Amino acid sequence: DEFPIGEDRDVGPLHVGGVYFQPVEMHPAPGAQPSKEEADCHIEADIHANEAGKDLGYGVGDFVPYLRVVAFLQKHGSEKVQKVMFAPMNAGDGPHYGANVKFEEGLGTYKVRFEIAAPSHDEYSLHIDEQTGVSGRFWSEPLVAEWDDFEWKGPQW
């Protein structure tokens, strides 16, 4: 049982989808994410190359590894913003950028914003020879996929 954060987005060379479901147990446990027991849910940011996509050398539909994905959550009526740092991981259904999440502000409607940064300069490279290499270059400022009316009503499991 998976529930959408909202409609999938196409931003630059990325096809971005967001879903949430029950908390999971991850090994190792990433950064400062809540445990399966402490968490409200698990949120997955699925990032696959789109047609644009190919200019960086990826095949359409391929998972795009080495990205740095963060989510910002803001409950409607509040000035507070919660930052969620996803981590790369595999589940039984494949790779994702994911995070166990506890909604600090509780039940309500949220603005949910994913910021997707390209790999760090020392973490990835592109072959750029004329004619034989790729023509595209990684984006400089993080790409954004946003949903303005995400409803968190508590566990649906």
Interacting residue ranges for Cl ion, rule: CB under 5 A? 72, 74, 111, 113, 120-121
CB 58 → Cl ion: shortest distance, Å?
A: 19
Rounded CA-CA distance 106/112 in Å is 14
Work out the burial of residue 120: count CB atoms within 10 Å of its CB; fewer than 13 is exposed, 13-18 middle, 19 or more buried.
Answer: exposed
By a kind-dependent CB cut-off of 5 to 8 A, residue 87 interacts, out of its own copies, Cl ion, none, with its own copies
Please count the other Cβ atoms lying within 10 Å of the Cβ belonging to residue 43. 24
Is residue 27 close enough to count as binding its own copies by CB under 8 A?
yes
Is residue 107 close enough to count as binding its own copies by CB under 8 A?
no
Is residue 63 close enough to count as binding its own copies by CB under 8 A?
yes
Give me 36's structure tokens.
């399966």
CB 150 → Cl ion: shortest distance, Å?
A: 11
What is the DSSP track for 82-121?
Answer: EEEE-EEEEETTEEEEEEEE--TT-SEEEEEEEEEEPPPT
Which is nearer to its own copies, 59 or 154 (by Cβ)? 59
Rounded CA-CA distance 51/77 in Å is 38
By a kind-dependent CB cut-off of 5 to 8 A, residue 113 interacts, out of Cl ion, its own copies, none, with Cl ion
Rounded CA-CA distance 85/71 in Å is 6
Is residue 62 close enough to count as binding its own copies by CB under 8 A?
yes
Give me 95's structure tokens.
């790779």
Which residues in the 138-157 window bind its own copies by CB under 8 A? none
CB 121 → Cl ion: shortest distance, Å?
A: 4
Q: Among 127, 140, 141, 153, indicate the residue that binds its own copies (CB under 8 A).
A: 127
Q: What residues make contact with its own copies under the rule CB under 8 A?
A: 21-22, 24-31, 36, 42, 56-59, 62-63, 65-66, 87-95, 121-129, 131-134, 137
